Design an enzyme around this catalytic site. Structure first.
Site: not given
Ligand SMILES: CC(=O)NC(=O)N[C@@H]1O[C@H](CO)[C@@H](O)[C@H](O)[C@H]1O
Ligand SMILES: *Cc1c(COP(=O)(O)O)cnc(C)c1O
Ligand SMILES: CC(=O)NC(=O)N[C@@H]1O[C@H](CO)[C@@H](O)[C@H](O)[C@H]1O
Ligand SMILES: *Cc1c(COP(=O)(O)O)cnc(C)c1O
Lengths: 805, 805
Positions: B346, B537-538, B543, B645, B649
């Site tokens: 990931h 996002k985190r 990011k 992801t 959304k």
């Molecule tokens: C250990 C790690 O990479 N944590 C993590 O949350 N990674 C995350 O996984 C998601 C699902 O594959 C990806 O969409 C994100 O790009 C990735 O940062």
């Molecule tokens: C979808 C989702 C994420 C992933 O978001 P990215 O922008 O792909 O890092 C993180 N936190 C929550 C609560 C989500 O629903």
């Protein structure tokens, strides 16, 4: 056949008999000894007969109604051919096509025999031509005044990849369109001295040169209006014997040849003589006509438009006549002068500005120099009263420039003596107010205006692209020909599968037509399925044909790197003439042919890439290449192309545009929507930022591997084996003194070019974007431009009323 | 009401009586003392009853047909709430809405009472949740296996603009969805030592911790399939007196709390224990179930998917059981292991990779260390035979990393012991083969695959945006809910004036809904007419929430410069949690609130710009904000976001995207067309070029006036009056050690943002582009993703057949 008029039984019969009549009585030939040229002339005289009646009644009409007259002074009128244009405006095309067909002749073949009237260098000269067409179409009592050069822009020959110039002897076989008017010959004075006596100054002991006018008809579009373009020719007065007669060819040299400088100034005495010659003769004609119709009403009956500063002497010449000959007081004369004169600027490049040495004017036109000094004195007094203590402003605004040699800034002269000053595109007009003419704008804001350029839809659509004009008329009628804004109605056909197919079909037909012509008159073949990438315009560093060259070499290098990789096929065509004394421009032409020599013969490239230099680019050639183009290159450095007009021609004919936000490109993108244009590169603001910092080409060379490879190829002799350092001047320029920062836009340009290739791969979407461009090209009709000049500068209302048959 | 199922007379009546039954018998309450929470639980138990029948018969079905079982091992399952999701998948929403309505209750109010099951950090944890939904919907015999943390991701509180963490005691009021299965408790071993005797090695003198499973039902979408998610809880075995009992809370700490690190690695012993705990218990369960159904057929009946390297110990644990306990020969055991295991990566950031110190494994899992050494030995022998003499390759590919402290690279362990390794987006998977895992790809190319991520359209469309799901169903039916590709049919409505109006209406409704919630639970008001610009996002430097901040300050500075100039109103919302020990991330949160403190109270700005930090971003909040967004910010430095992801959304819910060509953004733009996406910035290749040259932020600071102004404002204390140097660490980082080159994309980012504001001013065209995005979001359904895993990795065919009622 097409909407090229009706082919009536009575008319075709009449045309045929008049054709045979001229062939017999006018050409003194019989069908047994007549050649194609003879047939062209018989046809020309036949069509010419049809406008004489209208020409005579149009002028009689103006004499009777006595409307305000518009005088467009220009040292250039880039007319091109007039046979087809005349047939179009008279709705005689189909009839003549049928008549010649019945006589067993191909009219298209005969049209190719006519010589272009190349009395212009490029944009400025072509604008005057389009304007004449629009003024007639709009029913304005307008007169074009210029010089009848016996030699127009030189014919360009390419030998060993180099440009060779040869005299454009366009009058060799005669000109059936003009009518000499030796009875209206007027005298023009040169040299001499000024005598100050009791009541007024007198210009005496002058040398006299006669100005003989030749009139050419300018037909409006189907409105029966036929205006006049009057061109003056120099004649020596009749007052060792042999040598004295031979020396007459000293005075007559004034109208011998057009100076071939596009955007550049040469302070040559002969050019100054040409400028005064056209002005002096024209003003006498204007005043004569006026006295027929108190000079207080002069501005109400007369408007003179100065096409650039070339005819700027009209200002002091008008003052000379009113003060010296008519004996009006200065203030009164100045009032009249300012109110009748208007000036149009076409560039901001310093080397193009006319700054005549005082010693030249002093000797050639002593009285005008005194008048100019007086104008300057009174003008500066006004500046001083408006900005007390601002001494530097005084020196900046002076018409007289001090330094090595004192010079007269003709642009300053024009602003001071005109009630209106205009730029030729929104961005250009804004630049004039913020930079070059900032001081003048602050002093008299009301004088500054904008008049975005345009092109005539008759020659640039109906005439050169009948197939497109026809499929358009099929949907929305023919009214758009004299009301281009109606093209917007085509927006509702952007999803029409039938229209999409027809638009694409006409383009393919135009390309096949051009691909054939290329082999016919030049012999070398090309692939009709490739994207036609063309850049045609005069050769100049600011237009950046060099940036185009860099892209071409990039494409070639990428193919050589990955030969079996697919790339959209392209035929890049570059054409345009270089001023005879512009070394860099001539080196650029050589570079282009040199690139072709390598690219066009590389087995690995195949038919995926071809580089062709279009020889002798001129109006007639433009009518052929533009309708066949897919991609229009308008890549001048932001802030250098005042407007551009070739760009409009391409848009109207179904080509997509790749360009910088410069000149009219900005308004074109605004009209079509930026998503439907391929914009790239620095904006004017980015250029200024780079200049503040200091442009260093080395930086780009060091950070862009592909760019470095190209420079090393040029430097090592890759494109010139026998002459390794042939292009050393080009590399040195790009690397150390590039005023137009070719490298700064390189990366974004190649990136943008990849986007065009991507869209070309999707025929349907490419065509839909094309329709979006054509549908929004209405604003760029010269009819719109002229209507604005009429209402906002000349104070006259345009008319679409047919003249009484 | 909507397509949330039928509200049958019989069913509503039945729901009502079972609701009152649970309120009485289960909650032991009466309508006179019951509170909203009581009502939520009565409803939860009522809906829960509906899936038990299906849950029991689904599992019985698998026992009877004995299909190949899929085991998805993950240390994270970011489930969120399950009440509404359960009603949706069971087509019970309208019925429950009506039933509660008749009881005088508002179901929406009750839904807000449920606690999120926040057993995940972000993307990786949410992916596992969406996958569980899709596997059930596709009829796969799948089991999710993880840890039942009694404390999930911490609840985020913002105090004085700083992030404060508080325990997520989500089990406080109980969890009605889980079912404890103490009867299936299994023992897990730790520490001890290895004894080598006659026949085989023995792991002895170990400490035992019991693994107690809790099962949660996972309903498929209207297919009557109910799979299981089994989460293990740690229990001490029962074999000073007081102190000994109190010390039981040493073994049980294993399942106490989720480590809050998103994309970062901490080599803590407790985390290692959690990883082995889940693996050891899960594998015993798998083998037990298998023996029920010669381990040669093990891979034919079992597939285990490793979500990242967290459960990587499954490889040596499977070998340990097969070799030590089942007594299979090594080669045979290894064959079985490789064939049943698959690994998903990931991220490519080095600090996120698990590299466990050998001394830790040596003490905690002595037998596994020996097995890992043996695996490494045999693997390196294969490398040596394939690349003779390549000694550096040997050291690069070793599972054992030498240096200060020896470590085990778990990623290398996973590749060696898995028959398939996949990235989560096309660009990510390519990067893995060209960089990080290049050596492995060269050795075993067949193992590397791509499986682009996806999101479940049930929770991410139907559940959170019923208004949009409804207007869509009105045109194309409901079949798209489990076949998202059908959304393409909406492309034929892009010119439909009715659809355009409805799409725009639902968005406005969602925004009003969210604008209200903002004042309800947080109090501070916002303008519903502004463009909702959101980045949730985190919080992490890669990011680039900081690039977003720079844009916000740029907007504020431009307004202050020209206050009476019009600008499209915007509400920029940024939310996300920062790992507790990530200082820079916490400083970024403070910067955001600090910016808001200045911007939101500036009279001159008015309601033209608002900056809000969305507190406690979690799954339930995402369901609220995403449907209300206009602009989705996905601006990670090219090459850092494996997939993303949240981006999917937003696309599915009617927001346009501004982002870099990173992760799945590339495929999203490819699906919708680049003209319908707001792409900007460096591509991966540009990033590499900059690294070759050496990134120097100073250059950007010196050449971009607006950027300089911002840095000086931050440095001088403009955003922190009382604490002038509060943001000194941020400036120092940006200027001297920015691994993600925020400045390099600044200019293109702000330029791109101007283009979005331009499109927003044209409501009709903005909405048409939105329709273009929604219509092409089909590829991003997790059903497509899971179908690819099934066919290309697990060797099983998905099914859309309803289970026998
Ligand atoms: C250990 C790690 O990479 N944590 C993590 O949350 N990674 C995350 O996984 C998601 C699902 O594959 C990806 O969409 C994100 O790009 C990735 O940062
Ligand atoms: C979808 C989702 C994420 C992933 O978001 P990215 O922008 O792909 O890092 C993180 N936190 C929550 C609560 C989500 O629903
Ligand atoms: C002296 C000079 O500028 N020559 C010239 O040809 N200028 C040209 O005039 C055209 C018509 O206005 C413009 O469209 C071109 O931008 C300008 O370069
Ligand atoms: C239209 C035209 C021009 C002007 O072209 P630009 O690209 O605006 O410089 C020059 N030469 C000819 C023959 C033209 O027809």
């Amino acid at each position: 056949i097409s909407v090229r008029g009706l082919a009536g039984v009575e008319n075709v019969t009449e045309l045929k008999k008049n054709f045979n009549r001229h062939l017999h009585f006018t050409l003194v030939k019989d069908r047994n000894v007549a050649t194609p040229r003879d047939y062209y002339f018989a046809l020309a005289h036949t069509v010419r007969d049809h406008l004489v009646g209208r020409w005579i009644r149009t002028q009689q009409h103006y004499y009777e109604k006595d409307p305000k007259r518009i005088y467009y002074l220009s040292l250039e009128f880039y007319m091109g051919r007039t046979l087809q244009n005349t047939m179009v405006n008279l709705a005689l095309e189909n009839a003549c096509d049928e008549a010649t067909y019945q006589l067993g002749l191909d009219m298209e073949e005969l049209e190719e025999i006519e010589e272009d009237a190349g009395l212009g260098n490029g944009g400025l000269g072509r604008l005057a031509a389009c304007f004449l067409d629009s003024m007639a179409t709009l029913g304005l009592a307008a007169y074009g005044y210029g010089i009848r050069y016996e030699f127009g822009i030189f014919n360009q020959k390419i030998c060993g990849g180099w440009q060779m110039e040869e005299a454009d002897d366009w009058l060799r076989y005669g000109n059936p369109w003009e009518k000499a008017r030796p009875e209206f010959t007027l005298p023009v004075h040169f040299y001499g001295r000024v005598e100050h006596t009791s009541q007024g100054a007198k210009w005496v002991d002058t040398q006299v040169v006669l100005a003989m006018p030749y009139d050419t008809p300018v037909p409006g579009y189907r409105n029966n209006v036929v205006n006049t373009m009057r061109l003056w020719s120099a004649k020596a007065p009749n007052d060792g014997y042999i040598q004295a007669v031979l020396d007459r060819n000293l005075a007559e040299n004034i109208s011998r040849v057009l100076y071939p400088n596009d955007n550049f100034f040469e302070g040559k005495e002969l050019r100054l003589k040409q400028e005064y010659f056209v002005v002096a003769a024209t003003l006498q004609d204007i005043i004569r006509r006026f006295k027929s119709s108190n000079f207080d009403a002069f501005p109400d009956k007369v408007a003179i438009q100065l096409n650039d500063t070339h005819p700027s002497l009209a200002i002091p010449e008008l003052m000379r006549v009113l003060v010296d000959l008519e004996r009006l007081d200065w203030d009164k004369a100045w009032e009249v002068t300012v109110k009748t004169c208007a000036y149009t600027n076409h560039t901001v490049i310093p080397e193009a500005l006319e700054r005549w040495p005082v010693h030249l004017l002093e000797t050639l036109l002593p009285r005008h120099l005194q008048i100019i000094y007086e104008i300057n004195q009174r003008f500066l007094n006004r500046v001083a009263a408006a900005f007390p203590g601002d001494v530097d402003r005084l020196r900046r605004m002076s018409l007289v420039e001090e330094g090595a040699v004192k010079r007269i800034n003709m642009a300053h002269l024009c602003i001071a003596g005109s009630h209106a000053v205009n730029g030729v595109a929104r961005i250009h007009s804004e630049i004039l107010k913020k930079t070059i003419f900032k001081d003048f704008y602050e002093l008299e804001p009301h004088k500054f205006q904008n008049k975005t350029n345009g092109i005539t839809p008759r020659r640039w659509l109906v005439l050169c692209n009948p197939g497109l004009a026809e499929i358009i008329a099929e949907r929305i009628g023919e009214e758009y020909i004299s009301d281009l804004d109606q093209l917007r109605k085509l927006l509702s056909y952007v999803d029409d599968e039938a229209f999409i197919r027809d638009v694409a079909k006409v383009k393919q037909e135009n390309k096949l037509k051009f691909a054939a012509y290329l082999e016919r008159e030049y012999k070398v073949h090309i692939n009709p399925n490739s994207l036609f990438d063309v850049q045609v315009k005069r050769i100049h560093e600011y237009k950046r044909q060099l940036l185009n060259c860099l892209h071409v070499i990039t494409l070639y290098n990428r193919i050589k790197k990955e030969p079996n990789k697919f790339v959209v096929p392209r035929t890049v065509m570059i054409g345009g003439k270089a001023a005879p004394g512009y070394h860099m421009a001539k080196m650029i032409i050589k570079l282009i042919t040199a690139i072709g020599d390598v690219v066009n013969h590389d087995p690995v490239v195949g038919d995926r890439l071809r580089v062709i230099f279009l020889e002798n680019y001129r109006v007639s050639l433009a009518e052929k290449v533009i309708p066949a183009a897919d991609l229009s290159e308008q890549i001048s450095t932001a802030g250098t192309e005042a407007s551009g007009t070739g760009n409009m021609k391409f848009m109207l004919n179904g080509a997509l545009t790749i360009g910088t936000m410069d000149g009219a490109n900005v308004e074109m993108a605004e009209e079509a929507g930026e998503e439907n244009f391929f914009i790239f590169g620095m904006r004017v603001e980015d250029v200024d930022r780079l200049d503040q910092r200091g442009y260093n080409a080395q930086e780009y060379y060091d950070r862009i591997p592909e760019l470095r490879q190209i420079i090393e190829q040029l430097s090592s002799g890759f494109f010139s084996p026998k002459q390794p350092d042939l292009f050393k001047d080009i590399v040195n320029m790009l690397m150390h003194h590039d005023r137009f920062k070719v490298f700064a836009d390189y990366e974004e340009y190649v990136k943008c070019q990849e986007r065009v290739s991507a869209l070309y791969k999707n025929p349907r979407e490419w065509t839909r974007m094309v329709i979006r461009n054509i549908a929004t090209s209405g604003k760029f009709s010269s009819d719109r431009t002229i209507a604005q000049y009429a209402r906002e500068i000349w104070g006259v209302e345009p008319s679409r009323q047919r003249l009484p048959a």
